[PDB]
């Protein structure tokens, strides 16, 4: 029998430990990331503009992840106090004119294993609509805009045509045994991928099991009572129909004392749990301890997550 095939979509915060654990298993891995608001197509002056989804996936799928985490994370103190490795992605992107144009150089540089694909082969802009109706374009701008995000959408930077998937992307989704959405920020990591029509169709049609790994914590632009159920609801609304087959949610408590002592943003809280609402929406709901309290934060435990995923995975 062939190795199972697993495609991770989003690649936000928490995906590197999932990707590490997946690599220890006997499985092929593909990652899909959005690379938007990019280069000459961003509509910004060159001085004005100068993200982690790509960096996280690149380092996690590199030939020496431990090595490259150490390296892509050290900070000068000496310039003066900036992270090395953020400077490498900055450099190659400036060199090539956009991060999109740098992506093949970047996979060469990190000696990546498996496939990393952009969601589209054309330049994309990310748009957020806030609760009051205000529309903001650009991830860095969205993230800086005060308020609660209602919805996101993507457009082509260079024209009014409907954005299109990069097609090796469609085939990858359709030929997978499992799709892992997340973990990552819902609005700025996961959703930009699924709002491209050809990707939303592939998710709907794939024989793969679709698994969503929910956040440990609420994010900027999310309310205190934005439940795990609510996260599933937003995903389903953005794609246009229900489509998650399995949802994994953490129910182990993040102690207040740990959040206080570790100087967490005081408005980020543990994602509230709504079992009834999850069950109404998703066939298989997995609530368990998937929490790792280490390195000053409340992160996903990659192995506890991936052990569940390997238990349910089936070759299609």
Residue 95 near which of its own copies, Cl ion, none (CB within 5-8 Å, type-dependent): its own copies
The answer to the question of residue 188 lying near Cl ion (CB under 5 A) is no
CB 29 within 8 A of CB 19: yes
Rounded distance between C-alpha atoms, residue 244 and residue 209, angstroms: 8
The answer to the question of residue 305 lying near Cl ion (CB under 5 A) is no
- 3-state DSSP assignment of residue 287: strand
Taking the complex as a whole, how short is the minimal distance between the CB of residue 92 and its own copies, in angstroms? 7
Structural tokens at position 104: 């093949």
| Residues in a beta bridge with 83 | 75
Residue 92 near which of Cl ion, its own copies, none (CB within 5-8 Å, type-dependent): its own copies
Residue 71 near which of Cl ion, its own copies, none (CB within 5-8 Å, type-dependent): its own copies
151-159, 196-204, 210-218, 258-266 -> range binding Cl ion (CB under 5 A)? 210-218
Name the H helices within the chain: 15-24, 52-60, 65-71, 86-96, 99-109, 139-144, 168-175, 191-194, 197-205, 228-239, 256-261, 275-281, 302-312
Peptide bond into 131 cis (omega under 30): no
Binding site for its own copies (CB under 8 A): 46-47, 50, 64, 67, 70-71, 74, 76-79, 82, 84, 87-88, 90-92, 94-95, 105, 108-109, 111
Rounded distance between C-alpha atoms, residue 215 and residue 290, angstroms: 10
Taking the complex as a whole, how short is the minimal distance between the CB of residue 47 and its own copies, in angstroms? 5
Closer residue to its own copies in complex, CB, 104/283: 104
108-116, 129-137, 162-170, 213-221 -> range binding Cl ion (CB under 5 A)? 213-221
Closer residue to its own copies in complex, CB, 47/311: 47
Residue 169 near which of Cl ion, its own copies, none (CB within 5-8 Å, type-dependent): none
Residue 58 near which of Cl ion, its own copies, none (CB within 5-8 Å, type-dependent): none
Query: How many C-beta neighbours within 10 Å does residue 131 have?
Result: 12
Closer residue to Cl ion in complex, CB, 37/228: 228
Q: What are phi and psi of 161, to 5 degrees?
A: -75, 150
CB 188 within 8 A of CB 141: no
The answer to the question of residue 22 lying near Cl ion (CB under 5 A) is no
Among 8, 60, 102, 216, indicate the residue that binds Cl ion (CB under 5 A). Answer: 216
The answer to the question of residue 217 lying near Cl ion (CB under 5 A) is yes
Residue 74 near which of its own copies, Cl ion, none (CB within 5-8 Å, type-dependent): its own copies
Rounded distance between C-alpha atoms, residue 109 and residue 105, angstroms: 6
42-50, 52-60, 82-90, 207-215 -> range binding Cl ion (CB under 5 A)? 207-215
* CA 186 vs CA 4, 5, 9, 183, 190: distances in Å: 26, 24, 11, 8, 5
Closer residue to its own copies in complex, CB, 74/267: 74
Residue 158 near which of Cl ion, its own copies, none (CB within 5-8 Å, type-dependent): none
Residue 216 near which of Cl ion, its own copies, none (CB within 5-8 Å, type-dependent): Cl ion
* CA 171 vs CA 6, 145, 160, 202, 251: distances in Å: 13, 36, 25, 8, 35
Peptide bond into 191 cis (omega under 30): no
Taking the complex as a whole, how short is the minimal distance between the CB of residue 46 and its own copies, in angstroms? 4
Short-list 312, 235, 307, CA closest to 278: 235
Question: Can you give the binding site for Cl ion, defined by CB under 5 A?
Answer: 215-217
């Amino acid at each position: 029998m062939r190795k199972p095939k697993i495609t991770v979509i989003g690649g936000g915060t928490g995906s590197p430990v999932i990707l590490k654990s997946l690599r220890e298993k006997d499985v092929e891995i593909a990652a899909i990331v959005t690379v938007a608001d990019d280069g000459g197509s961003s509509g910004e002056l060159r001085k004005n503009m100068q993200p982690g989804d790509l960096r996280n996936v690149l380092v996690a799928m590199s030939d020496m992840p431990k090595f490259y985490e150490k390296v892509f994370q050290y900070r000068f103190s000496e310039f003066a106090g900036h992270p090395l490795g953020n400077l490498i992605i900055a450099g190659l992107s400036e060199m090539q004119g956009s991060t999109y144009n740098a992506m093949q150089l970047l996979s060469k540089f990190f000696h990546t294993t498996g496939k990393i694909y952009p969601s589209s082969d054309h330049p994309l802009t990310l748009h957020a609509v806030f609760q009051d109706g205000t529309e903001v374009a650009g991830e860095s701008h969205i993230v800086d805009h005060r308020g609660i995000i209602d919805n996101v959408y993507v457009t082509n930077a260079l024209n009014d045509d409907t954005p299109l998937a990069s097609r090796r992307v469609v085939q990858t989704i359709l030929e997978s045994d499992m799709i892992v959405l997340g973990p990552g920020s819902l609005f700025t990591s996961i959703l930009p991928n699924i709002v491209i029509k050809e990707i939303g169709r592939a998710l709907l049609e794939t024989k793969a099991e679709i698994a969503y790994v929910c956040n440990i914590m609420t994010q900027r632009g999310e309310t205190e009572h934005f439940t795990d159920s609510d996260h599933v609801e937003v995903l389903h609304r953005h794609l246009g129909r229900p489509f998650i087959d399995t949802v994994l949610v953490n129910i182990e408590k993040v102690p207040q004392e740990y959040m206080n002592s570790n100087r967490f943003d005081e408005y980020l809280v543990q994602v509230e749990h709504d079992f009834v609402g999850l069950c109404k929406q998703v066939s298989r709901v997995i609530s368990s301890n998937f929490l790792r309290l280490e390195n000053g934060g409340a992160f996903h435990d990659g192995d506890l997550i991936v052990d569940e995923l390997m238990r349910i995975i089936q070759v299609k």
